[PDB]
Design an enzyme around this catalytic site. Structure first.
Site, PDB file in Angstrom:
ATOM      1  N   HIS A 126       0.756  -1.337  -0.126  1.00 16.31           N
ATOM      2  CA  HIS A 126      -0.048  -0.152   0.016  1.00 16.31           C
ATOM      3  C   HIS A 126       0.855   1.265   0.099  1.00 16.31           C
ATOM      4  O   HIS A 126       0.182   2.395  -0.493  1.00 16.31           O
ATOM      5  CB  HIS A 126      -0.796   0.182   1.017  1.00 16.31           C
ATOM      6  CG  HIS A 126      -2.092   0.803   1.235  1.00 16.31           C
ATOM      7  ND1 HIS A 126      -2.172   2.165   1.987  1.00 16.31           N
ATOM      8  CD2 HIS A 126      -3.224   0.922   0.188  1.00 16.31           C
ATOM      9  CE1 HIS A 126      -3.097   2.536   1.563  1.00 16.31           C
ATOM     10  NE2 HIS A 126      -3.892   1.851   0.506  1.00 16.31           N
ATOM     11  N   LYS A 128       3.372   4.405  -0.720  1.00 11.68           N
ATOM     12  CA  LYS A 128       3.370   5.191  -1.979  1.00 11.68           C
ATOM     13  C   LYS A 128       4.634   5.899  -1.789  1.00 11.68           C
ATOM     14  O   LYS A 128       4.824   6.739  -0.728  1.00 11.68           O
ATOM     15  CB  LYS A 128       2.348   6.255  -2.192  1.00 11.68           C
ATOM     16  CG  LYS A 128       0.810   5.617  -2.294  1.00 11.68           C
ATOM     17  CD  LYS A 128       0.072   5.566  -1.156  1.00 11.68           C
ATOM     18  CE  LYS A 128      -1.489   5.284  -1.081  1.00 11.68           C
ATOM     19  NZ  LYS A 128      -1.311   3.920  -2.049  1.00 11.68           N
ATOM     20  N   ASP A 133      17.904   9.364  -5.564  1.00 12.72           N
ATOM     21  CA  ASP A 133      19.400   9.470  -5.355  1.00 12.72           C
ATOM     22  C   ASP A 133      19.755   9.367  -3.834  1.00 12.72           C
ATOM     23  O   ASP A 133      20.520   9.631  -3.190  1.00 12.72           O
ATOM     24  CB  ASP A 133      20.154  10.739  -5.746  1.00 12.72           C
ATOM     25  CG  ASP A 133      20.023  10.715  -7.158  1.00 12.72           C
ATOM     26  OD1 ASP A 133      19.945   9.877  -8.006  1.00 12.72           O
ATOM     27  OD2 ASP A 133      20.477  11.994  -7.687  1.00 12.72           O
ATOM     28  N   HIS A 412      -8.774  11.572   0.870  1.00 12.24           N
ATOM     29  CA  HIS A 412      -8.166  10.147   0.694  1.00 12.24           C
ATOM     30  C   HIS A 412      -6.790  10.407   1.502  1.00 12.24           C
ATOM     31  O   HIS A 412      -6.000   9.503   1.555  1.00 12.24           O
ATOM     32  CB  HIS A 412      -7.265  10.123  -0.703  1.00 12.24           C
ATOM     33  CG  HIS A 412      -6.823   8.798  -0.975  1.00 12.24           C
ATOM     34  ND1 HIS A 412      -5.472   8.546  -1.189  1.00 12.24           N
ATOM     35  CD2 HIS A 412      -7.570   7.724  -0.972  1.00 12.24           C
ATOM     36  CE1 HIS A 412      -5.304   7.196  -1.231  1.00 12.24           C
ATOM     37  NE2 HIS A 412      -6.490   6.716  -1.523  1.00 12.24           N
ATOM     38  N   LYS A 414      -4.118  10.650   4.916  1.00 13.34           N
ATOM     39  CA  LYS A 414      -3.971   9.862   6.101  1.00 13.34           C
ATOM     40  C   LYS A 414      -3.171  10.657   6.772  1.00 13.34           C
ATOM     41  O   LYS A 414      -1.515  10.364   6.942  1.00 13.34           O
ATOM     42  CB  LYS A 414      -3.260   8.289   5.831  1.00 13.34           C
ATOM     43  CG  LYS A 414      -3.799   7.512   4.645  1.00 13.34           C
ATOM     44  CD  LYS A 414      -3.132   7.786   3.144  1.00 13.34           C
ATOM     45  CE  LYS A 414      -3.928   6.917   2.451  1.00 13.34           C
ATOM     46  NZ  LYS A 414      -5.463   6.647   2.596  1.00 13.34           N
ATOM     47  N   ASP A 419      -1.358  18.983  18.801  1.00 12.75           N
ATOM     48  CA  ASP A 419      -1.191  20.019  19.706  1.00 12.75           C
ATOM     49  C   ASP A 419      -0.334  21.330  18.703  1.00 12.75           C
ATOM     50  O   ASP A 419       0.407  21.955  19.298  1.00 12.75           O
ATOM     51  CB  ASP A 419      -0.242  19.630  20.613  1.00 12.75           C
ATOM     52  CG  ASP A 419      -0.937  18.719  21.575  1.00 12.75           C
ATOM     53  OD1 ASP A 419      -2.394  18.704  21.892  1.00 12.75           O
ATOM     54  OD2 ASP A 419      -0.269  18.015  22.565  1.00 12.75           O
TER      55      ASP A 419
END
Length: 580
Positions: A126, A128, A133, A412, A414, A419
């Site tokens: 899952h 991404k 380099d 979408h 996450k 704080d």
């Protein structure tokens, strides 16, 4: 630092002070910065994707082959850069990793692609990731795939050889994920929905770029997965898929100096080893938070019962709120969720069984049953739970065919902010699939500010972190829409304004568009009669237009009673942990 032992939060990587990091909201700036980084690559490009669309454009609008992902990687490969790509091999889902793989390796021999897994399993790769380099690394919720590119305008329409192109979403990129899943991906420049009658679904996401040692750490995760994958089948063991090796010594957009720690979920099946440091970091950040949490996530499935749902993120949120209430603290939890899950399903019919299964577990977390957040809060404090948690979604409107149209903004992201000082950004949803480690493989970074800015917290002077404050303010500003005071995120005046806006917008959108989900449809039988009514948007566009002038921002209240009289679980043979 070292990789001989585990570190804070049981992560394979230690926290890296002095890290330059820059956040991105929405694909437009993230994909542009990916494009700039690809262009400056000198040795290696590492890419992991759940879905990779080879012909996606990284800068818009396309006027030529420049900034097309496949062309950019082919040009770098032709200069000697080695491109190594790890793609999820889905169970023929419709992302067609076979077409992506063959297309990428046709570009140049310096581009090598492996797919995983080969064995039948419920779980997926899952994460991404794109690393240049081993020194610049992008991660977050955005795949280099169709439908992901968007900007603050969240355009619902796209009406305007590519020399005269004015479309922002060419062909398969123009899509409404809820309306229809992608088809015919080997015809990338062909439309599969009607541009003149069907609005886009806007895509909201969060990404991040880090430099220096955490980019090395992310490269080390890719390398571990790459060399492990080589051993998984005969074709991959040959030298045509080279072993990758980490840079060891001497570890650019406009970023902020922070302390960054890489975190991941991996298992034997997905890598060489077990880790669930994303979960550990989520729990600890909630446990130690003192003033507020801002959660923007595609899923919200938690509150353990020891059997069906196991992760304890919801339980930590409940415990934190209960402590704040017991000590008399001002404490707020903001939860931003997509109004409907991202699968193809006619919500006017009730949604598919996949949508209904997700709705079951979402509402089980939020407000339905003995384990839900709201039930446990109500048991301790009655209706006071509303002072401590707000669950919202996003919606926008536009014009198509001569009348207003509306669509949810697909959350979408996450991301977690605590704080105004700490941020978690990654691929990990709040569900068992992402967090347990044993299931999907995931990545995240924990970003802690070391530099601060004067701000406010419940009226008191407060040293907020620079990275976290700018992100949180940027989120709030777009969601709420000039004369707004966004300094204090928890004071009573601001929390009231937040709740009032969410309810006011939700009421207007329901008045003009009769959009789903809604509290007015508690059962499927009442849903069937509710959708049989023509909305004001098309009945009288002038009246609709006038009332839409009262919508402020995109924030809408999340309807907690939608289909609350239905079981929403399917009777069917799919194991339930597919959805949790």
């Amino acid at each position: 630092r070292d990789f001989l032992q585990l570190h804070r939060h049981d992560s394979y990587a230690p926290p890296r002070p002095g890290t330059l990091a820059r956040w991105f909201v929405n694909g437009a700036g993230y994909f542009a910065a990916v494009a700039d980084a690809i262009l400056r690559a000198q040795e290696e490009i590492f890419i992991t994707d759940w879905w990779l669309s080879p012909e996606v454009y990284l800068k818009r609008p396309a006027h030529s082959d420049d900034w097309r992902l496949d062309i950019m990687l082919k040009r770098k490969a032709e200069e000697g850069v080695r491109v190594s790509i790890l793609l999820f091999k889905e169970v023929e889902l419709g992302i067609n990793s076979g077409y992506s793989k063959r297309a990428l390796m046709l570009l140049h021999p310096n581009i090598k692609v492996m797919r995983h897994p080969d064995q039948v399993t419920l779980w997926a790769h899952h994460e991404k990731l794109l690393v240049v380099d081993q020194v610049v690394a992008f991660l977050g919720g955005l795949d280099l795939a169709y439908g992901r590119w968007d900007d603050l305008h969240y355009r619902l329409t796209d009406l305007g050889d590519l020399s005269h192109n004015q479309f922002f979403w060419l062909g398969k990129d123009y899509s409404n994920l809820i309306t229809k899943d992608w088809v015919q991906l080997d015809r990338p420049f062909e439309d599969f929905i009607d541009r003149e009658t069907t609005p886009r679904m806007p895509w909201r996401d969060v990404g991040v770029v880090v430099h220096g040692l955490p980019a090395r750490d992310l490269a080390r995760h890719f390398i571990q997965r790459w060399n492990f994958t080589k051993t998984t089948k005969a074709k991959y063991k040959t030298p045509t898929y080279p072993y990758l090796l980490p840079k060891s010594t001497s570890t650019l957009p406009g970023g902020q100096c922070t302390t960054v720690q890489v975190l991941r979920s991996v298992d034997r099946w997905s890598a060489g080893t077990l880790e669930n440091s994303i979960l550990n970091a989520y729990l600890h950040t909630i446990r130690e938070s003192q003033h507020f949490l801002y959660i923007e996530n595609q899923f919200f499935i938690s509150c353990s019962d020891g059997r069906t749902v196991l992760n304890k993120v919801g339980d930590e949120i409940v415990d934190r709120i209960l402590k704040a209430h017991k000590q008399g603290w001002c404490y707020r939890v903001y939860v931003l969720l997509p109004l409907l899950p991202g699968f193809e399903g006619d919500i006017s019919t009730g949604g598919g069984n996949s949508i209904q299964a997700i709705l079951h577990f979402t509402y089980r977390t939020l407000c339905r049953g003995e384990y839900s957040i709201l039930h446990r809060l109500k048991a301790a404090m009655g209706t006071a739970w509303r002072d401590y948690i707000s669950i919202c979604g996003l919606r926008t409107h536009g014009e198509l065919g001569g009348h207003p149209v509306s669509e949810l903004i697909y959350i979408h992201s996450k991301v977690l902010i605590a704080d105004d000082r700490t941020v978690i950004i990654g691929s990990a949803n709040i569900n068992d699939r992402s967090l347990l480690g044993k299931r999907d493989s995931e990545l995240a970074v924990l970003i802690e500010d070391t530099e601060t800015e004067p701000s406010l917290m419940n009226g008191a002077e407060y040293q907020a972190g620079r990275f976290a404050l700018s992100l949180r303010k940027h989120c709030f500003g777009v969601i709420l829409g000039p004369d707004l005071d966004l300094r204090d995120p928890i004071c009573d005046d601001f929390f009231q304004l937040w709740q009032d806006m969410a309810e006011s917008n939700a009421n207007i959108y329901e008045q003009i568009f009769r959009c789903l989900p809604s509290n007015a449809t508690r059962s499927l039988r009442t849903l069937r009669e509710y959708v049989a009514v023509e909305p004001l948007a098309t009945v009288s566009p002038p009246l609709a237009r006038s009332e839409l002038t009262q919508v402020q921002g995109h924030l809408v209240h999340f309807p907690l009673k939608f289909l609350e009289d239905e079981s929403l679980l399917p009777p069917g043979m799919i194991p339930l942990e597919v959805w949790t």
